[PDB]
């Protein structure tokens, strides 16, 4: 039961009440407002299923039932482990329900400005997430595309990649470092996902071939044209189709 | 609660009050103005999230809650570490909210008149910034273009550069000094950003080549025309295309 103080006094809660102050009435059942107390409205607790969460933001300094202090302008998710149905405070301005972001085995998502250890958003950064993880988005965060599918690929399929961010001796599946802006193909009987640093460029496709058959190609790094033949052969990281001129 | 002195006296704050003086009332809750005090308006604290800041400027000499003195015409940002929501003073004229300038890994920005150690703006100068840094602009500062993207480039890509500011034995990636106004190409499997001194001129592009094929070129420094052939070859810092005349 939301209330207001029309005069300085003490409420049944026993809190000191300055004029114009507002406060909740936790008590269940029929309740009589005090002569200074003024009725406003009943405040329903927001439903909190495992699939749902409740974003909140402090209007000013205070403390929640769980004892966590809330400075002005702070924002926080409300998980089910806390309460099955939290009741918003007079200083807890709701921003809205946050649906859970589920992921499939073949799904992954890039979170813009991933939440730091500090609890402050990390501006100018992004963080990939995968592995059937299901999680509510932290405040101030958003997906770039909305749960990208994993690029599963076979030996006849291949994907070019480029290092937007220089130096990655680790993390890469080949465990090989790369200079910024260089390209390299990946291929094999496996699924793959782009890293936060590397970015996809183009998808090489199967190029069926038989004996006494092939295609002209060119090594752009040195201009080396040559006619590949025989067995099926996907283009490497730099080779490109070359055109004959009769 | 903003107020004014209609007569010389002392306020509840205990400050000496000359006629026409104005002052804040920090106290929360209901408050009765004094017979000399005159009601004006409630003054809300500006919201201060990590992404936001509040620019301010002194109208005259005074002191803030944090004890920092403010001479007339001085300007200062208000960060969240100070207060979650600062309340403007009668002498603190607001100039406006300042949004944070976030940067990506591939982003960088040039600040005109970068803030000095003195706290005064450095006229006629500029300062590059990069590395996913996120920062509010200092007063009197502005970007030249608005967060330029880093020039990532491969071995087949190259960018010409020119020394607008003479002598740079350090800072340059090659660690080589240059006379003012000279040009030199840069190339390799790496990202690159212009320095505050050096400026980009043109972007050399890949020039595919094979055996028994090439292009005429000319060395402008000495007029030396010659026909490069064979392997792929990007133009150097001075060579330019030369035209055959049958």
Q: Is the distance from CB of A244 to CB of A216 less than 8 angstroms?
A: yes
Torsion of Cα atoms, B100 then B193 then A122 then A149, to 10°:
120
For residue B30, the number of C-alpha atoms closer than 13 Å in the C-beta half-sphere is 13
Determine, for residues A73 and B80 on separate chains, whether the beta-carbon distance falls below 8 Å: yes
The residue to which tokens 């810092």 are assigned: B237
Residue-level length of chain B: 246
Rounded Cα distance between A171 and B240, Å, is 42
Neighbours of B174 (CB within 10 A): 9
Contacts of B246 (CB under 8 A, 6+ apart): none
Which burial class, exposed, middle or buried, applies to B178 when counting CB atoms under 10 A from its CB (0-12, 13-18, 19+)?
A: buried
Closest CA to B85 of A122, A59, A77: A59
Neighbours of A231 (CB within 10 A): 10
Neighbours of A133 (CB within 10 A): 12
Rounded Cα distance between A107 and A104, Å, is 5
Torsion of Cα atoms, A220 then A221 then A223 then A226, to 10°:
-70
Residue B9 is encoded by which pair of tokens?
A: 């006296």
- From first CA to last CA, the distance across chain B in angstroms is 88
Determine, for residues A73 and B51 on separate chains, whether the beta-carbon distance falls below 8 Å: no
DSSP A120: S
**Test the B interface: residue of A19, A38, A70, A72 with most B CBs within 10 Å:** A72
How, if at all, do strands B158-163 and B183-187 pair? Answer: antiparallel
Determine, for residues A61 and B84 on separate chains, whether the beta-carbon distance falls below 8 Å: yes
For residue B20, the number of C-alpha atoms closer than 13 Å in the C-beta half-sphere is 0
Closest CA to A236 of A245, A221, A246: A221
> Interior CA angle at B116 toward B111 and B120, to 5°?
100
Torsion of Cα atoms, B67 then B70 then B74 then B80, to 10°:
20
**Test the B interface: residue of A58, A180, A199, A239 with most B CBs within 10 Å:** A180
Rounded Cα distance between A10 and B84, Å, is 28
> Interior CA angle at A113 toward A109 and A116, to 5°?
105
Determine, for residues A73 and B133 on separate chains, whether the beta-carbon distance falls below 8 Å: no
Q: Of chain B residues 90-109, which have a CB less than 8 A from chain A?
A: 100, 102-107
Closest CA to A111 of A124, A128, A98, A123: A128
**Residue pairs spanning A and B at CB distance below 8 A:** 105
The residue to which tokens 């001796």 are assigned: A169
Would you say the C-alpha torsion A234, A239, A241, A242 has a positive or negative sign?
Answer: negative
What distance lies between CA B118 and its chain's CA centroid?
Answer: 17
- From first CA to last CA, the distance across chain A in angstroms is 88
For residue A206, the number of C-alpha atoms closer than 13 Å in the C-beta half-sphere is 10
Resolution (A): 4.9
């Amino acid at each position: 039961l939301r209330l207001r103080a029309r005069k300085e006094c003490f409420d049944r809660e026993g809190k000191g009440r300055v004029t114009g102050e507002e406060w909740l009435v936790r008590s269940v059942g029929a309740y009589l407002p005090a002569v200074f107390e003024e009725v406003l409205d009943l405040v329903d607790a927001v439903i909190l299923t495992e699939k749902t969460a409740l974003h909140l933001r402090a209007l000013q300094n205070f403390r929640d039932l769980r004892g966590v202090l809330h400075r002005t302008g702070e924002e926080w998710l409300v998980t089910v482990q806390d309460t099955e149905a939290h009741v918003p405070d007079v200083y807890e301005e709701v921003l809205g329900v946050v649906p859970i972001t589920t992921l499939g085995p073949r799904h992954y998502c890039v979170i813009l400005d991933p939440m730091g250890p500090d609890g402050k958003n990390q501006l100018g950064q992004k963080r990939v997430v995968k592995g059937e993880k299901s999680f509510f988005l932290q405040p101030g965060e958003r997906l770039e595309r909305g749960i990208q599918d994993v690029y599963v690929l076979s030996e006849q399929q291949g994907l070019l990649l480029k290092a937007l961010q220089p130096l990655e001796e680790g993390e890469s599946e080949e465990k090989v470092s790369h200079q910024a802006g260089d390209c390299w193909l990946i291929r094999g009987p496996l699924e793959y996902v782009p890293s936060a640093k590397v970015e996809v460029v183009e998808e090489r496709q199967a190029i069926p071939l038989d004996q006494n058959e092939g295609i002209y190609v060119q090594d752009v790094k040195t201009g080396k044209v040559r006619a590949v033949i025989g067995s099926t052969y996907m283009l490497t990281q730099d080779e490109v189709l070359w055109e004959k001129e009769l």
